[model samples]
Target: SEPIVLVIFTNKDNKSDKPNDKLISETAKSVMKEFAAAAKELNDLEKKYNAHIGVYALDTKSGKEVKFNSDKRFAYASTSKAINSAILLEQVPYNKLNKKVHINKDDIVAYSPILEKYVGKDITLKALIEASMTYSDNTANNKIIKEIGGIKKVKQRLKELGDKVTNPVRYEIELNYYSPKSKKDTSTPAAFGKTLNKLIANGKLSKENKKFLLDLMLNNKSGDTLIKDGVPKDYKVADKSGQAITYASRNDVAFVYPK
Candidate 1:
């Protein structure tokens, strides 16, 4: 009986060593589910407004992030000043900050009381930047533009900073209640965010210049509903906001430092 029942077996293969057989953890599955639900809710709100919004959020430490339509371009409005400030600080010498610049009739732009009162007087580039960035003063911006070699340099510096969508072609005096297709400056949320990130990371800027920029933003009085409203009162936020009177567009971009 033993001889008749001689064993005959075939070899079996194991795929544990294959990389493709790896499995996803349950924690990963949960995170995916959560993200999908959040995306759906955000999409519904955007659809309700019949509007487009670009947003990006990242944890400075862990690099965890979320984004929605962050690449969509739109009219940048006064937010262009933030970009302009970065360009100015990077190129201009420290001593130039103290140099007096004239705010004559030619430099005056609408919506600038600071310059209006100080007309025919000389103001330092530093003071102009403070007024422009903090209060969104058009005259201050124009003066700053003139001192920094005009809009040509502004656009060039933006390009150098790796942004392609933003183009500042007109003076702030030309900015209207509504940005017609002709006069509108253009940028995307993602592009502007990267610009800010680069500014924050720039090693070339002296500590004094860096502090000056941050102070202006922290004291920004142009608008408060965007970044300031989103965080607790104690938290520090550096941001720029812009809007059109006709409600055609409103945007705010910022860096929120957690407490």
Candidate 2:
């Protein structure tokens, strides 16, 4: 034996006590494998909650993915507001956000937190987008829908984005039925995940518009009890949540960054 054949990192830049980055990355591969193994546990959770849960996670660092029930349809609900943000930004120039959008007493609808208070007032388009995404303002979302040529155009836009699967029959609150048998405003997790990924990358949004959307998502001022609470505190997440009636169809889509 050649003196136990010691292998040590002696460079000053190296942290002698710490595992190398390559070692850590390799260890993470094993941790990532657990996601595929979580299928049974997720099935049990679905039964316990009496609801369907879908997840699609992509690790940018490792290029690893985890998916469960990702092909099943689920009501998109208020998360449509997030979609509207991407579509609106895609069509409008960033400078045009300063343009005023008038809100009337008639424009107010159920669950329009910010717009309800500002009825008959004029706010910048930026404020409208912010209100819709940050507060899930139904009326503001409607206005954005109208600004982008209404529901039919929104449907067309969805198809153009390669998300022809999400059925949109009506606008905002009108589309949140979330019934087990109903199909209005529904999307497969795979479809929605691809939609979000396109918004995140794949050249769907400009630099400024992407940042604008990300800023609103990061705020997630709507609430934080769902996906936010599920992850560790050290991770930073930007997400949008959706809530539906009677059956309690709750959903969240997000980008989670870990150090």
Candidate 3:
């Protein structure tokens, strides 16, 4: 088996000069207890869904984080769109968002409502991107993949971002050819979280582009129920969700913003 890769971040600079070991221990134990309970439920889910789960989280204020099977790779599904979006946000300019691209019939695939309306019409790059990220539109996702120079370039961009664990080898449509039981576009929990963190930390994105990405994440129109299930109504949550029914995979990666 491959060695597990895990990275944990702590804001040591922001911590008090006098650390409270007892308090930190208590907090850690409390979080661990919650994880144990969730693990039991996830165990039950595994039997029902025939799936394995991976998770990663961080407390913004303290920078304390948590993980379970963070290095295990799974079918990335639509979550790859977030990676593509980040790459586009950095390499593609905001002015180009409104630039029109003809909707190719060859790019069209089933199970996408967002693209259903614009099948024969031209659509802006930004609209396609929004559809891909917010609604997980298959056609828009394939178009974006093509515009970015295909799956090889996407893998290169992920590697450039320090994501060593994500290997996206084909477009969404190609998944049909490969066995859902076989490897498709793959990523680790830690890799996905780190990519998002890098996208936030890097200055490559313009102010407007940054807002665009976060806003789309916050306005998540689909598949966030798993991670956002218990989040408060008014809380600002930024996340991307992914699932492949054929592979029986479901995943959510998120960053809860501070008020």
Candidate 4:
């Protein structure tokens, strides 16, 4: 009887109320389980949407990772503007560039009635960044790419940033050769996640530079769309979204806080 009684008492103590840290840890693990389940659903949704999806999300406070198909390569879409920012800064040095670059008719590649609406010489580099990221404007993107020295400069900057992939920016014309069939214009979720971590850790960019990048992403006009749907309304998220034409691929990277 004594032996059985001791065992029961010990079990009761083990089942007793837990400390705060233990509760937090268990809660975090449970949240990770939720992320895993949601990720599976997202994978399924990709087939339904006729799109390929890749994502990497980290919650630093909880030390939890939520990854889904993170290895697949998807086009950066407008999110490629971040690379454009780096290249432009290297050449124009953020100080002397007047925060603007001119775009004229001669530089135009694939002109649209829509593209022409944004035409003018005094267009600021900052405006192009906004249009590329927030508005997903092709002309604005082209203008910046030209002033910053074209796709070659963009690729070099990616290499300098330690990306093993050689990224080439495809103008609208190159899309015929490289858009639908080409796998070269792609981005990996893990690489993007690492880029975010590097940016925050190393301070590789100027204070204004980093803020400009993150702010454009945070206010991303399309947030109500998909990946941002993963988190609750009150949570804070900094994200960049990507896709190819007709939604062939979808990519997103986010740092999110719990609501």
Maximum-TM-score candidate: 2
Tens digits of per-residue lDDT for model 3, 225-245: 434444444445566766554
Instruction: Give the lowest summed-lDDT range of ten residues in model 2.
Output: 1-10
Q: lDDT by residue for model 4 over 1-259, one digit each (tens)?
A: 0000000000001222221212211222233345332223543444433333445555444445556566665555545555565456545544554575556676555533335554565666766666666766667667777776777776666676787653565864343232434566666666655554554423366767666666777788564453345445655555555444433333444445444
lDDT of 2 by residue, 48-142 (tens): 43444565555554555556666777777887788877888887778788999888988888988789878878988899999888888889999
Q: Candidate 1: how large is its RMSD?
A: 19.0
Candidate closest to the true structure, highest lDDT: 2
lDDT of 3: 0.61
The alpha-carbon deviation from the true structure for residue 119 of candidate 4, after best TM-score superposition, in angstroms, is 3.7
Q: Candidate 1's residue-wise lDDT over 1-259, tens digit each? A: 0000000000012212111100111111122233222223445534544444455554444555555566655556777777677667876766669888777786777889678878889998888888888878888888777777898887787787787776677778554243334435666556766666665534367777877887788778654655456445655667766654433556665655544
- Computed on alpha carbons, the lDDT of every model, listed in order, comes to 0.58, 0.64, 0.61, 0.50
Which regions of candidate 1 are displaced past 4 Å? Answer: 1-40, 47-50, 58-60, 93-96, 176-184, 201-203, 245-247
TM-scores vs. true structure, each candidate: 0.76, 0.80, 0.75, 0.68
Off by over 4 Å in 3: 1-51, 59-62, 176-183, 201-203
Q: Rank the candidates by lDDT, best first.
A: 2, 3, 1, 4
User: In model 3, what are the clashing residue pairs, if there are any?
Assistant: none
